[PDB]
Design an enzyme around this catalytic site. Structure first.
Site, short mmCIF file in Angstrom:
data_model
loop_
_atom_site.label_atom_id
_atom_site.label_comp_id
_atom_site.label_asym_id
_atom_site.label_seq_id
_atom_site.Cartn_x
_atom_site.Cartn_y
_atom_site.Cartn_z
N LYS A 127 8.81 -0.02 2.77
CA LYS A 127 7.65 -0.49 2.02
C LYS A 127 6.56 -0.85 3.06
O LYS A 127 6.91 -1.31 4.15
CB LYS A 127 8.01 -1.73 1.17
CG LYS A 127 7.06 -1.99 0.01
CD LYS A 127 7.25 -3.39 -0.63
CE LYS A 127 8.36 -3.46 -1.67
NZ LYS A 127 7.88 -3.10 -3.03
N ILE A 149 0.81 -1.22 0.00
CA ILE A 149 0.00 0.00 0.00
C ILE A 149 0.85 1.29 0.00
O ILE A 149 0.32 2.36 -0.28
CB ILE A 149 -1.12 0.02 1.08
CG1 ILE A 149 -0.56 -0.17 2.49
CG2 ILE A 149 -2.23 -0.96 0.75
CD1 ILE A 149 -1.16 0.74 3.51
N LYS A 191 5.45 -2.68 8.11
CA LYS A 191 6.47 -1.76 7.61
C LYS A 191 7.73 -2.60 7.40
O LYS A 191 8.20 -3.27 8.32
CB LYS A 191 6.70 -0.63 8.63
CG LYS A 191 7.37 0.63 8.10
CD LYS A 191 7.29 1.75 9.16
CE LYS A 191 8.09 2.97 8.80
NZ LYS A 191 8.10 3.97 9.90
N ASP A 193 7.69 15.72 12.63
CA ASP A 193 7.25 15.56 11.23
C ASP A 193 5.74 15.46 11.13
O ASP A 193 5.22 14.63 10.41
CB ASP A 193 7.96 14.36 10.55
CG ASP A 193 7.79 14.32 9.02
OD1 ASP A 193 7.59 15.39 8.42
OD2 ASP A 193 7.85 13.21 8.45
F1 LIG Z 1 -3.26 3.40 4.92
C1 LIG Z 1 -4.02 2.28 4.97
C2 LIG Z 1 -5.00 2.11 3.97
C3 LIG Z 1 -5.83 0.96 3.98
C4 LIG Z 1 -5.64 -0.02 4.98
C5 LIG Z 1 -4.65 0.14 5.97
C6 LIG Z 1 -3.80 1.29 5.97
N1 LIG Z 1 -2.78 1.41 6.95
C7 LIG Z 1 -1.52 1.98 6.84
C8 LIG Z 1 -0.89 1.84 8.04
C9 LIG Z 1 0.45 2.32 8.42
C10 LIG Z 1 0.87 2.13 9.77
C11 LIG Z 1 2.13 2.61 10.16
N2 LIG Z 1 2.98 3.25 9.34
C12 LIG Z 1 2.59 3.45 8.06
C13 LIG Z 1 1.33 3.03 7.54
O1 LIG Z 1 0.93 3.23 6.22
C14 LIG Z 1 1.57 4.21 5.41
C15 LIG Z 1 0.81 4.33 4.08
C16 LIG Z 1 1.61 5.21 3.09
C17 LIG Z 1 0.81 5.46 1.79
N3 LIG Z 1 -0.50 6.04 2.11
C18 LIG Z 1 -1.34 5.18 2.96
C19 LIG Z 1 -0.62 4.89 4.29
C20 LIG Z 1 -1.84 1.19 8.87
N4 LIG Z 1 -2.95 0.90 8.19
#
Ligand SMILES: Fc1ccccc1-n1cc(-c2ccncc2OCC2CCNCC2)cn1
Length: 305
Positions: free
Chosen positions: A20, A16, A36, A128
């Site tokens: 990564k 997502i 992560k 940040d």
């Molecule tokens: F984002 C979501 C959408 C749908 C389902 C679950 C998630 N989700 C992301 C995290 C998450 C937790 C900790 N660090 C980073 C995280 O995501 C970074 C991405 C970067 C790109 N944009 C979206 C978020 C937790 N659940």
């Protein structure tokens, strides 16, 4: 090699984000998580700093902080299993809505204030804060991520001056408050040097839809002189913050390290060959291994009802 140990506990789904970020399923509980993935070789020299950030997250447990469940380290990778936030980024939410009303901004801002004040109470600073770093969970509650951008940076932080992380956080929160109510940045430019000049000057347009109290709160947060910025303490019960609430922001954590949930210890004990007391002792060590993950995920399963 890299994914072998992880695959014993999680069923991997799609990427997502690119560290990564992959969506996954915790095998034992069936609970969705975000993983992560960090390449140690890619980080190289900045690797010890990522290790200090992981240690800080181990010390943060709060209703508005995206929960760390599990840390797995191999020869080439670091895996961080985190709380599932399907509502996505507050950045995407602002764009879809264009801008939020004063009332809806307050609902979201009090959650940001609660998380940030708790982070400061624990002896840390975020540094940040930006809407890409705030995610919505299934209950539409905010969760702060990516501990440790130019448009959100305090003047002193850009100038390379010594700063207090708490004061830089208050400035970034002032930028977030403006974006929530306006749908655009107070300081913006296509050229990085011109943006740098705009931030240090501290002058911004005040749109016509902003109320007099909103305007005054922005002034108190967006002070170029960090010593003139409102303290976190005065933000908790600020008159704009108390409007329609009449109680200060509850910043204290509701998610304990000390107290253990009896139902979750019970559920967990059936998957292990130990007695209950040994199980409670093992959980209380908070090693961020599979045992920590299973316990915290059972608690999340319970809270859903
Ligand atoms: F984002 C979501 C959408 C749908 C389902 C679950 C998630 N989700 C992301 C995290 C998450 C937790 C900790 N660090 C980073 C995280 O995501 C970074 C991405 C970067 C790109 N944009 C979206 C978020 C937790 N659940």
């Amino acid at each position: 090699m890299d994914y072998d140990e992880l695959l014993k506990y999680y069923e991997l789904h799609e990427t997502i984000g690119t560290a990564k970020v992959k969506l996954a399923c915790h095998i034992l509980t069936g609970e969705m998580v975000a993983i992560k993935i960090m390449d140690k070789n890619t980080l190289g020299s900045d690797l010890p700093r990522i290790k200090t950030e992981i240690e800080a997250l181990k010390n943060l447990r709060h209703q508005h902080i995206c929960q760390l469940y599990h840390v797995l380290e191999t020869a080439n990778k670091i895996f961080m299993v985190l709380e599932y936030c399907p509502g996505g980024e507050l950045f995407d939410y602002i764009i879809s809505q264009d801008r939020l009303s004063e009332e809806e901004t307050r609902v979201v801002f009090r959650q940001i204030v609660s998380a940030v004040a708790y982070v400061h109470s624990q002896g840390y600073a975020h540094r940040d804060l930006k809407p890409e770093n705030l995610l919505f969970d299934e209950y539409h509650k905010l969760k702060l991520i990516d501990f440790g951008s130019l448009a959100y940076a305090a003047p002193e932080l850009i100038q390379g001056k010594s700063y207090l992380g708490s004061e830089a956080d208050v400035w970034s929160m002032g930028i977030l408050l403006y974006v929530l109510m306006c749908g655009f940045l107070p300081f913006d430019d296509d050229n990085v040097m011109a943006l740098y000049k705009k931030i240090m000057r501290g002058k911004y347009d005040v749109p016509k839809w902003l109320s007099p109290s909103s305007i005054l709160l922005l002034q108190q947060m967006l002070q170029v002189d960090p010593k003139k910025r409102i303290s976190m303490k005065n933000l908790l019960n600020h008159p704009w913050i108390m409007q329609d609430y009449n109680y200060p922001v509850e910043w204290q954590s509701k998610n304990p390290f000390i107290h253990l949930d009896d139902d979750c210890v019970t559920e967990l004990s059936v998957h292990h060959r130990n007695n209950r007391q040994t199980m409670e002792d093992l959980i209380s060590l908070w090693q961020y291994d599979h045992l920590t993950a299973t316990y915290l995920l059972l608690l999340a399963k319970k809270a859903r009802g």
